[PDB]
From a paper:
Most bacterial and all archaeal cells are encapsulated by a paracrystalline, sheet-like, proteinaceous sheath known as a surface layer (or S-layer). In Gram-negative bacteria such as Caulobacter crescentus or Campylobacter fetus, S-layers are retained on cells by lipopolysaccharide (LPS) or endotoxin molecules present in the outer membrane (OM) (Fagan and Fairweather, 2014, Sára and Sleytr, 2000). The S-layer of C. crescentus is composed of a single, 1026-amino-acid-residue, multi-domain, S-layer protein called RsaA (Smit et al., 1992).
The subtomogram averaging map shows large anisotropy in resolution, with the resolution highest in RsaANTD, close to the 6-fold symmetrization axis. All α helices of RsaANTD are resolved in the cryo-ET map, and large side chains are resolved, which fit the density well without any further refinement. There are very few contact sites observed between RsaANTD and RsaACTD, showing why the two domains can oligomerize independently. The two domains are connected by a short linker region, which appears as a smeared density in the cryo-ET map, suggesting some flexibility. The density for the LPS O-antigen is clearly resolved near the RsaANTD domain, and this density ends within the RsaANTD layer and does not extend outward to the RsaACTD. This indicates that upon secretion and assembly into an S-layer, RsaA proteins localize at the very tip of the O-antigen.
Numbering used by the authors: 2 to 1026
Write the structure that this text describes.
Amino acid sequence: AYTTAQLVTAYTNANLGKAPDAATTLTLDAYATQTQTGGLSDAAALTNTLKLVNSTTAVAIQTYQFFTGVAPSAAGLDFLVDSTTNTNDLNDAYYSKFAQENRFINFSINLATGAGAGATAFAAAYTGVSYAQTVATAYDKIIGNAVATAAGVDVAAAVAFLSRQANIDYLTAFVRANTPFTAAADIDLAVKAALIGTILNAATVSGIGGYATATAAMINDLSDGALSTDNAAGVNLFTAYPSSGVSGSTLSLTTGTDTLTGTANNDTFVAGEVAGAATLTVGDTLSGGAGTDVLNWVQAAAVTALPTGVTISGIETMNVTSGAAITLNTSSGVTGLTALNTNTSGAAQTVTAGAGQNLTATTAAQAANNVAVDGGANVTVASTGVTSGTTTVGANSAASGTVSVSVANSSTTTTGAIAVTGGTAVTVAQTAGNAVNTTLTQADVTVTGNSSTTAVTVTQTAAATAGATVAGRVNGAVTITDSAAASATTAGKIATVTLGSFGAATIDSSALTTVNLSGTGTSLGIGRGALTATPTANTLTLNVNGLTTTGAITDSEAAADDGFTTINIAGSTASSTIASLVAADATTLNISGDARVTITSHTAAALTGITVTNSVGATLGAELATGLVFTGGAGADSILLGATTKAIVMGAGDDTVTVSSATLGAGGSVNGGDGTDVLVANVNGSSFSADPAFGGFETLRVAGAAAQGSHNANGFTALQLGATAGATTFTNVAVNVGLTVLAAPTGTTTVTLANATGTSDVFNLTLSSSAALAAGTVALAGVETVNIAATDTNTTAHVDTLTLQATSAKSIVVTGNAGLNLTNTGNTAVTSFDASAVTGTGSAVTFVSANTTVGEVVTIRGGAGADSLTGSATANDTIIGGAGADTLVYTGGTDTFTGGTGADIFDINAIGTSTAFVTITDAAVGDKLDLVGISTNGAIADGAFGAAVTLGAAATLAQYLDAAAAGDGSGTSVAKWFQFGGDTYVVVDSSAGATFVSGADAVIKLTGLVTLTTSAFATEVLTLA
Ligand SMILES: [Ca+2]
Ligand SMILES: [Ca+2]
Ligand SMILES: [Ca+2]
Ligand SMILES: [Ca+2]
Ligand SMILES: [Ca+2]
Ligand SMILES: [Ca+2]
Ligand SMILES: [Ca+2]
Ligand SMILES: [Ca+2]
Ligand SMILES: [Ca+2]
Ligand SMILES: [Ca+2]
Ligand SMILES: [Ca+2]
Ligand SMILES: [Ca+2]
Ligand SMILES: [Ca+2]
Ligand SMILES: [Ca+2]
Ligand SMILES: [Ca+2]
Ligand SMILES: [Ca+2]
Ligand SMILES: [Ca+2]
Ligand SMILES: [Ca+2]
Ligand SMILES: [Ca+2]
Ligand SMILES: [Ca+2]
Ligand SMILES: [Ca+2]
Ligand SMILES: [Ca+2]
């Protein structure tokens, strides 16, 4: 049932956006309602709608294909049928008086004989052939000759009609009048164009013929809005929309003896069950003919063997499916067989194919069942739900072509062996799909090549540690062996090996040149064949990509035999890390490519050079030999040097050399090259500026297990600090040079500037870590403004710690996105602490002023964090928290508190006077007033204590105080409150008489009228309600 509003959309898209005339809307509506009532099926109604678009559209698809060899693309069609840009187009003004027929004729003549796209080709193809032949051959290509006769239209009566003399005379006159042709050749040529226009019309109106059937399917595809093929430079109808009406004949086996013979065509043979009794049975003989022949053998019972007297012949594909095990051998009885496919679900397989036959053994829910296959041309094993089951290929007979195993396991019980022997190329692809809190350990793989085996690939799922939401995987050992691995003379064929994760892996091949690594590895041991001949080509290419290793890549051959002299490592698309590289015969080492290669530790004593050419860079964690030359490229290369004897160059990009000894040797130099390069001093003191042996460095970092003592900063533009052996000092530090601390050092870090003597000295300290960093003590004698950045490198919040010793700093400014608890002891010149710019949920800043200048103005600013800001008893502190749960502490003097947004706590730890007291500017609902530290005698109220003290129209502040303290606070301190002159006050009475005594009784001012009626005392803690 189509609604009439669906048929109009189907017509619109067929007409490429032209909406139907009023008349036709009525026609479609009829087709809709005839489907609501079941007087017409669905597909019937939609066909008729698309038949209405014949003249507009079908005229452009069919003619373009016949003349230019391809149907116009959808974008193209838009232009010919319905467009803004072509003023005159098929469904527009110019053509509105041309019938269906004369539309096809028009298009034909345009594309064929003019400057049209087909002129040159059609002119050469149909020159010097007669009218009769023109028509007969064209009728064959369009309408089929066989097809037409079967459809029952008589071909000969039709072709004669089109070529009769009357007909040709009509067109001659037609073409002569209409087209601008006057030459006698061009008229003859245009007449043929008009005829094969006429034939296209006659085809598309009857629905017989190949052109009509294909074009119909393309308009149906164009119906729903989008064209599936839509190639940009045209779609060849016949390719994209296949007919293939012939499908040969379909033959059924019985529980008897069958004698079945195919059509020499696309025929298919069914060998199912009858009452649960097999239909491939004794004496059955099957015969195929031509090459589209299929036998489908399906049985509840286990396949066992071919039954007595059975002969299958001339059949190309055999499909065997069993409810139980399969055991068959097809090296005889079956002849002509190109493809064998065997299918189990939950039982064993034991299959042997003849060479020349492509085997495919698919097994679901393999469990403890074993797959074993042999022989065949290309073999494919596809095993899922695996568990204990061995997979084993070519144990008895190798494949002619490629092996391609793949094995999936969901279990926690471990994936059972996989062994392959032989094949041109081998791939074994394991996966692990176990649950989120389990560990599956994967399958041990063995591949043993025959003398055709050029390549081997062994992929697994990446290892991981079993977590809360991390699926755990351990990797299987892999063992790859070439035929000629044990031979003294025979060549060896395995050239390339690809791994994608692995446990304890081995290769052994004298023909090996390339290893491709990937994912998570334990160890690779490379041996070459025991060839006695001294090898001449000794280049290991080692392409890495996302590789990480527990342990060692070793050249097992190098030790007692002839290893690789040159190793090339090409890092690609992802970072790689090789825990250890052991290559005892290696001479050159070239690290190349695309993404970082890190070698944590190499053992390659005979190395004469290392050469990075890689874009991102290379890092080597092992200290180079004192004799060993190193050359960097662009990108952050990074090494360790000792008392080097050679000229080390680092190339462009931001490089990093760590030195274990302060002066080099022999001679014996290291140039950082272009870019900002770090020099790391793992030593007891340095003076790199002095030594011309070092050049091109910009940053000095003191970090390492031997890093310590006095270091000449001169000539460096930045400073860094890491973990250290002991107290470290930077001397001769230029102006605008900042220190970044990257890890906890040992002992006091002293910075002494080049010239500290001025009174506007600025230093930039940075703290930069992923985790909480205990920066320790840094001393900044003679600096007036100290800027601290506390930087978190990851998304998860932390709080850094620092003792600053800056005895002439007036300003401390804190920026960043992590918290800073700052020890401030003895920093007494500080009058401005500004942590206001700081940023996280909890980048918590702690500060306590060490200022003792009587009557000072000190300004303390918090950040977004839950900050803890304490003033000085000496000082008139202005304290301001930012966002978040700030604690502001009162110590003495005239203080001004502003906890911004959030549940702030105003912690009152001093009594004050009657003049020097704390004013809280913005006390609001949620803020607390901690009076624990003024409970001189006992501990406050504890109730909700909340009726304001009220006095007269002209009572003085002095009077309101005295009134509030009237009671006896000698044994037990009491809270009261009042509102005077537009501000709110709180009192603690700790005294006898009705005098508020300045000394021991306490007042706290709160800007504005804030009603504490309903607000309650926690312990001694008043929460504003
Ligand atoms: Ca349009
Ligand atoms: Ca138009
Ligand atoms: Ca479509
Ligand atoms: Ca039978
Ligand atoms: Ca056949
Ligand atoms: Ca055949
Ligand atoms: Ca060997
Ligand atoms: Ca040897
Ligand atoms: Ca050796
Ligand atoms: Ca470099
Ligand atoms: Ca550089
Ligand atoms: Ca440089
Ligand atoms: Ca220098
Ligand atoms: Ca962090
Ligand atoms: Ca100074
Ligand atoms: Ca200072
Ligand atoms: Ca104070
Ligand atoms: Ca804050
Ligand atoms: Ca706050
Ligand atoms: Ca607040
Ligand atoms: Ca307190
Ligand atoms: Ca009193």
